Paper text:
We divided 18 fragments into two main groups based on the conformation of the enzyme to which they bind. Group 1 (fragments 1–5) bound GlcB structures retain a closed active site lid conformation, and Group 2 (fragments 6–18) induces an open lid conformation. In the other 13 fragment structures, this region, which we now refer to as the active site lid, undergoes a major conformational change. The Gly-459 backbone rotates ∼70° and moves 3 Å away from the Mg2+ ion, and the Phe-460 backbone moves 2.5 Å (measured at the carbonyl oxygen), and its side chain flips by 4 Å (measured at Cγ). The large conformational change of the active site lid ultimately creates a solvent-accessible portal that is ∼7 Å in diameter, distal to the CoA binding tunnel entrance, and very close to the Mg2+ ion as shown in Fig. 2. Although the Group 2 fragments also maintain their aromatic rings in the hydrophobic pocket, in contrast to Group 1, none of the 13 fragments of Group 2 coordinate Mg2+. Moreover, the majority of Group 2 have no direct interactions with the residues of the active site lid. Instead, ring substituents from this group hydrogen bond primarily with ordered water molecules that gained access through the opening and were not observed in the closed lid conformation of the enzyme. Seven of 13 fragments in Group 2 were separated into subgroup 2.1 as they all make a hydrogen bond with the backbone carbonyl of Met-631 (dN-O = 2.6–3.2 Å), resulting in a relatively high ΔTm ranging between 4.6 and 8.6 °C. Eight of 13 fragments in Group 2 (6–12) form hydrogen bonds with the backbone carbonyl of Met-631 through a nitrogen on a five-membered pyrrole moiety or a fused indole, thienopyrrole, or quinoxaline moiety (6, 7, and 9–12) (dN-O = 2.6–3.5 Å). Several fragment hits have nitrogen-containing groups such as pyrrole, indole, thienopyrrole in which the nitrogen interacts with the backbone carbonyl of Met-631.
GlcB generates malate and coenzyme A (CoA) from glyoxylate and acetyl coenzyme A (AcCoA) following the conversion of isocitrate to succinate and glyoxylate by ICL. Because of the essentiality of the glyoxylate shunt in infection and the absence of it in humans, both ICL and GlcB are attractive targets for drug discovery. The active site is an ∼20 Å-long tunnel located at the interface of the TIM barrel and a loop comprising residues 616–633 of domain II. A Mg2+ ion required for activity is bound at the bottom of the active site tunnel in an octahedral coordination by one oxygen each from the carboxylate side chains of Glu-434 and Asp-462, two water molecules, and two oxygens of glyoxylate.
Author numbering: 2 to 71, 75 to 303, 312 to 727
Write the structure that this text describes.
């Protein structure tokens, strides 16, 4: 065929081989029984999966027709959504009962990294990013300005280094204050009677709160490092007077190390391009290596844990790696990794649950067959499930997980669930969605891109929508952000599960990140997404300056969003825009699509630093495609713009995207032979067919074009 027959299934040999030879050994699950369970799970769960997808289509069909007869009566609109089953009754108050959850999630607040699992070295970097140098972060980025004269160059600018040092000293004052004086005047550190004691030029002092002293290394009389704790996060003062930086430091300090990326999401969904059996296996194989703890790539090796000395005691170890979640794909797509007897593809999410769940077994244990490094410490498996619509699709995820756990021979509720709030039918039924996963949920979060794509698609027929930039401050999205935090805290998330907020996408603009991203913890988010290990470290500053626990209890019991605000469709007003503004918005959207699409389709890259139309480096996932294509399809549908406008724009934008990828040998230009670039045709189709797509999802077209490209590369 060539495939492996097991019941109604025809399994791609690469997958069959990978599973039996690499993933199964060490798990004590008998191969023939694993494959029987797979057959059974797929046979039993496929019908309901399909039933859900159909229900999505029926609802959207009803809304499309409703809008085609029309301001908007919100009373009648709201009651329509209730009649059809879109808006469901808000259940009574409850508290989640999820148990066996790691410390990283229950108690601590901090940055959360996301990385495409298909890139080993990015995945490895993310795992080791649990601890990072603040000096390197401050020195290498624009947090410390190049004026003056702190300009960066080949040589080490000693002027810049002093700025870094002073910056770090201040942070210490702010986060672990001394009873008198400041770290900036320190001459040394000693450990007397299980207390940190700091040497001043005048006298000496202790911590204003001695309980913030976590541990140390070396002799108590002359420590090689000091370990501090604040708001659950650790701070390490590396002390070494013989160091280059140390010789010039008043107290011999070499560096300050911050606990940064507390948890990481290894991503199988929107940051990766994976359209067939071969791609899935490359992804499963890295997930395997991460869980074994033996993954290593050729630039290297997962960092082992960090050992310290307790204040008045023996040794203790702290986790050196970021706690790994995995984002499986959602309920939509199928993949040829497995087909049935009639040749139709199996649902890709069901597959991920089985395989990523199986592979995750190796991370619950350290052995010669399971590999040396453990992930979860409380025996959990953390799966973020994206793009769910409403509480019934959450319950289906519960059931899927529950069924997988039987096949894997795991205790029930082993497989925990991160509910991404990124679709409108979830937003407005959020409390119900959490309720359906009440014994499994460990995470909710919000974002911009997917949610705004769905916003636009759901109300496609209602009229033209505001510009993408404008969306970020519209009533619905402000309500959506608050209503998430509120639903969460009301379900008892504080001290139990993460409340997360979106990615900082501008990877070179770190000064701005430090200035503004502090808004997310101030809004009571226990975690938020960062695009790099450097960003994780800088964002960790915010959890020191903000007591997320304190903020969360202050927000307790508040109902800051109304259903009316959630349901306020972002229609543009009359007149609204001038020609030049319209063209500018089209260009920006065609550049966004083209810029991301060309690397996805031509090179199978789903996450990278893509310069936007103003050459700013952005790190967005595939959901950039959905928001951009839906906005244009919306503008197209209501005659704000034409198909020829869109094509003229794609043709204008293409050569810029081309020259923006000049430093690439494997890059192939889209201009001037437009109609012969699979990437180009993919970008054009995403728009002109955008309105027909199920909920505006881009994967159907995208996967097919990537398949088409790989097929032409087979000759
Ligand atoms: O929501 C976003 O903008 C966003 C998500 C992800 C995942 C990555 Cl890996 S990079 C990235 N950006
Ligand atoms: Mg998304
Ligand atoms: Mg405090
Ligand atoms: Mg439709």
């Amino acid at each position: 065929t060539d495939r492996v027959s097991v019941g109604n299934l025809r399994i791609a040999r690469v997958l069959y081989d990978f599973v039996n030879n690499e993933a199964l050994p060490g798990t004590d699950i008998d191969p023939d029984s694993f494959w029987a369970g797979v057959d059974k799970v797929v046979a039993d769960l496929t019908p309901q999966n399909q039933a859900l997808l159909n229900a999505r289509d029926e609802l959207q069909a009803q809304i499309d027709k409703w809008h085609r007869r029309r301001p908007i009566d919100m009373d009648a609109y709201r009651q329509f959504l209730t009649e059809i089953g879109y808006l469901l009754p808000e259940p009574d108050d409850f508290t989640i009962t999820t148990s066996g959850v790691d410390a990283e999630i229950t108690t601590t607040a901090g940055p959360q990294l996301v990385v495409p699992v298909l890139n080993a070295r990015f995945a490895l970097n993310a795992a080791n990013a649990r601890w990072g140098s603040l000096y390197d972060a401050l020195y290498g980025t624009d947090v410390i300005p190049e004026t003056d004269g702190a300009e960066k160059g080949p040589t080490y600018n000693k002027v810049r280094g002093d700025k870094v040092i002073a910056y770090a000293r201040k942070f210490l004052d702010d986060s672990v204050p001394l009873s008198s004086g400041s770290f900036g005047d320190a001459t040394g550190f000693t450990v007397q009677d299980g207390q940190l004691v700091v040497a001043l030029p005048d006298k000496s002092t202790g911590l204003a709160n001695p309980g913030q002293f976590a541990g140390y290394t070396g002799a108590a009389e002359s420590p090689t490092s000091v370990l501090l704790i604040n708001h659950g996060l650790h701070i390490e003062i590396l002390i070494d007077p013989e160091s280059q930086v140390g010789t010039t430091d008043r107290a011999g300090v070499k560096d300050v190390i911050l606990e940064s990326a507390i948890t990481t999401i290894m991503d199988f969904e929107d940051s990766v391009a994976a359209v067939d059996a071969a791609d899935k296996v490359l992804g499963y194989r890295n997930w395997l290596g991460l869980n074994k703890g033996d993954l290593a790539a050729a630039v290297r090796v997962l960092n082992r844990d960090r050992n310290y000395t307790a204040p008045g005691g023996g040794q203790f170890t702290l986790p050196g790696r970021s706690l790994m979640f995995v984002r499986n794909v959602g309920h939509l797509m199928t993949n040829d990794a497995i087909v049935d007897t009639d040749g139709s593809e199996v649902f890709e999410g069901i597959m991920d649950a089985l395989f990523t769940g199986l592979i995750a077994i190796h991370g619950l244990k350290a052995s010669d067959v399971n590999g040396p490094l453990i992930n979860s410490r409380t025996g959990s498996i953390y799966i973020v499930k994206p793009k769910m619509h409403g509480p019934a699709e959450v319950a289906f995820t519960c059931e899927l997980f529950s069924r997988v756990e039987d096949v894997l021979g795991l205790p029930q509720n082993t497989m925990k669930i991160g509910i991404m709030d990124e679709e409108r039918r979830t937003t407005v039924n959020l409390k119900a969605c959490i309720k359906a996963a009440a014994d499994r949920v460990v995470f909710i979060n919000t974002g911009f891109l997917d949610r705004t794509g769905d916003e636009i698609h759901t109300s496609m027929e209602a009229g033209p929508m505001v510009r993408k930039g404008t969306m970020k401050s519209q009533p619905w999205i402000l309500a959506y952000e608050d209503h998430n935090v509120d639903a969460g805290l009301a379900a008892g998330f504080s001290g139990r599960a993460q409340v997360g907020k979106g990615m900082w996408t501008m990877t070179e603009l770190m000064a701005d990140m430090v200035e503004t991203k502090i808004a997310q913890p101030r809004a009571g988010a226990s975690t938020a997404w960062v695009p790099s290990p450097t960003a994780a470290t800088l964002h960790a500053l915010h959890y020191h300056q903000v007591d997320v626990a304190a903020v969360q209890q202050g927000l307790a019991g508040k109902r800051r969003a109304t259903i009316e605000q959630l349901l306020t469709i972002p229609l543009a007003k009359e007149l609204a825009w001038a020609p030049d503004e319209i063209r500018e918005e089209v260009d920006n959207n065609c550049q966004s699509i083209l810029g991301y699409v060309v690397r996805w389709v031509d090179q199978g890259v789903g996450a990278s630093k893509v310069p936007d139309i103003h050459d700013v480096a952005l790190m967005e996932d595939r959901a950039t495609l959905r928001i951009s294509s839906q906005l244009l399809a919306n503008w197209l549908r209501h005659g704000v713009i034409t198909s020829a406008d869109v094509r003229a724009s794609l043709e204008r934008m293409a050569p810029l995207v081309d020259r923006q990828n000049a430093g690439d040998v494997a890059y192939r230009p889209m201009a001037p032979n437009f109609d012969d670039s699979i990437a180009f045709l993919a970008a054009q189709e995403l728009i002109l067919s955008g309105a027909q797509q199920p909920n505006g999802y881009t994967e159907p077209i995208l996967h097919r074009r990537r398949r088409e490209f790989k097929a032409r590369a087979a000759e």
